[PDB]
Amino acid sequence: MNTVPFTSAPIEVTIGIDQYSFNVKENQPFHGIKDIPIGHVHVIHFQHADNSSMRYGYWFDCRMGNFYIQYDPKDGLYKMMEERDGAKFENIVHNFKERQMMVSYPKIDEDDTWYNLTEFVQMDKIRKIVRKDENQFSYVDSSMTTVQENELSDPAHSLNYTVINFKSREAIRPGHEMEDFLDKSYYLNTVMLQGIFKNSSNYFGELQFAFLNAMFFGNYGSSLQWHAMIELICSSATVPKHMLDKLDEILYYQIKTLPEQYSDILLNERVWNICLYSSFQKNSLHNTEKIMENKYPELL
């Protein structure tokens, strides 16, 4: 069990941790989140009561350090910071607990939802997408752009997702134009799985990272990336059986977790009708098909 204390809560804000979240009132004595499961990545995020634009947060992993939260009034937002002094940190943590000014990571033990969403998400991979290597945690918001979007401005704030382009030399072997483009197996298996990602589990990690970034920040580039990663698999006639079965589980939990009223911007009508009904893998996402039909019959 890990803790993430907050110095202070100067401003009214909705705080989120993983898929949980709490309203905190201006200068309410809030001082942190306790009983956080060591073992996966987590993400703590924020929406100010005054600017429902710009949701923002930080991905992190307690095994990499002791992190806390402090409001910065020059920049006007909650910043994640790391305490290097081992002793000084346990001291703030134990006092606020004994003053009980902390909320408990509220995990039902039947619920496997966060793990199912983050199974393959590794911090090391996250920090190669949000490059800022003086910090062990990664900052994301609503308005950050990806590298593919910058191509079609400020590169420090880039989301360096892996670039997938169906109509590119990379994706299309000369002479196999029609083949490679109707049947993306080449691109998936050899270019992306064996070449760039090395294994299935990285691929999935990025796909899952993409999803969460879109869900928690309505990061529009992240949505696009996630659907592109889905699309590449679903447009591939030859996929390892383990990936198909894992993919059906990975999406299922993604569809399950999504707020019901956001189904319009976060779900690309084309990609999903292709995955479930048109593409090679129509028959292979039994669980994702079913949740999709009973939850969002409209979009289909």
Binding site: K167, S168, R169, I172, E177, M178, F181
Partner: protein, 237 residues
């Protein structure tokens, strides 16, 4: 973006561009089997690639061999069309290569786009106009060369004959599309009109008769009349 009635005069500036029409690429007949099922027999097709500024036509003949042992043939015709347009571009000198290419059918966009990857600075554009290049095969000499071929064969024409020597592209193209519109709507009639007078002949190197100026006017008038007639008959107006 897409080509329509607004951006219509762009065809005639000095930016090299081509039209690609694929309607006549995969051509079949339909007949009955001995067992009474239905079966298709294919015939030689042609890609219609045309420089609307100069009248230069790059008529790529598509032999029936290309289909031999192939599935999803109508889809394949698109990729073949795109393959053969890309090979045409690569065979041309850089300065002869087009800056843009307009497909008369939106389905060809993806195939050509894929095939033209090596020419990123060559724009592929759909069109909203309703061009009549499917009736390219009602022009006797084009149909003949297509139907005679024994092998894939490229044949070059100028589809404006020598008209540019006395008129503009804009006008050439309009004549061309009008004559083809009529041939599409009622071929028998359009063809009657063009050949009624045995004394106006088609030069060996030409596709159309050698009308004088005055005669071209008569003809455009008669072609226009035919096309209105056929529409009233179509919708009872």
């Amino acid at each position: 973006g897409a080509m329509n009635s607004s951006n219509y005069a762009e065809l005639f500036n000095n930016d090299i561009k081509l039209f690609v029409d694929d309607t006549n690429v995969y051509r079949v007949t339909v007949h009955k089997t001995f067992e009474g099922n239905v079966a298709t027999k294919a015939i030689n097709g042609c890609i219609f690639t045309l420089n609307p500024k100069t009248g230069h036509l790059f008529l790529k003949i598509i032999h029936t061999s290309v289909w031999a042992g192939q599935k999803r043939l109508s889809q394949l015709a698109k990729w073949k069309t795109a393959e053969e347009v890309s090979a045409l571009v690569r065979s041309l000198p850089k300065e002869e290569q087009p800056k843009q290419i307009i497909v008369t059918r939106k389905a060809m966009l993806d195939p050509l786009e894929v095939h033209m990857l090596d020419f990123p600075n060559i724009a592929i554009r759909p069109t909203e106009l309703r061009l009549p290049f499917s009736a390219a095969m009602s022009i006797d000499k084009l149909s003949d060369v297509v139907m005679k071929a024994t092998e894939p064969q490229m044949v070059l024409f100028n589809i404006y004959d020598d008209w540019l020597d006395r008129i503009s592209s804009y006008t050439a193209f309009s004549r061309l599309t009008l004559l083809l519109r009529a041939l599409k709507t009622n071929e028998e009639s359009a063809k009657m009109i063009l050949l009624s007078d045995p004394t106006i002949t088609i030069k060996s190197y030409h596709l159309w008769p050698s009308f004088t100026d005055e005669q071209w006017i008569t003809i455009e008038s008669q072609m226009r009349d035919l096309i209105l007639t056929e529409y009233g008959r179509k919708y009872n107006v």
